[PDB]
Amino acid sequence: RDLICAQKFNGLNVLPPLLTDEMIAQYTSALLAGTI
Amino acid sequence: FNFNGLTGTGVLTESNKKFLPFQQFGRDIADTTDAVRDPQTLEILDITP
Numbered sequence A: 001r002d003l004i005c006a007q008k009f010n011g012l013n014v015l016p017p018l019l020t021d022e023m024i025a026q027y028t029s030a031l032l033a034g035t036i
Numbered sequence B: 001f002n003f004n005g006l007t008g009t010g011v012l013t014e015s016n017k018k019f020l021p022f023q024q025f026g027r028d029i030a031d032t033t034d035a036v037r038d039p040q041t042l043e044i045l046d047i048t049p
Helices: A002-010 A021-035
Strands: B011-014 B025-027 B033-036 B045-048
Touching: none
Parallel strands: none
Antiparallel strands: B011 B045, B025 B033, B033 B045
């Protein structure tokens, strides 16, 4: 958007998490399949 | 570049912003120039680091 692009030019940055929100949903299935 | 005393460094590209006839400058939320009108020929330009 505008704020996100504005801060990139100045020098600020945001980094992606190592574990994506898809692998997290794969851990939870393992934590939930074993319990049941 | 040096536009009427305002200097800077950045890439110049053809602009598409809807400037009013009397306007001369385009400023941002961080108070940094983004667009300007050439003083010799009448057009619009976009400046970006």
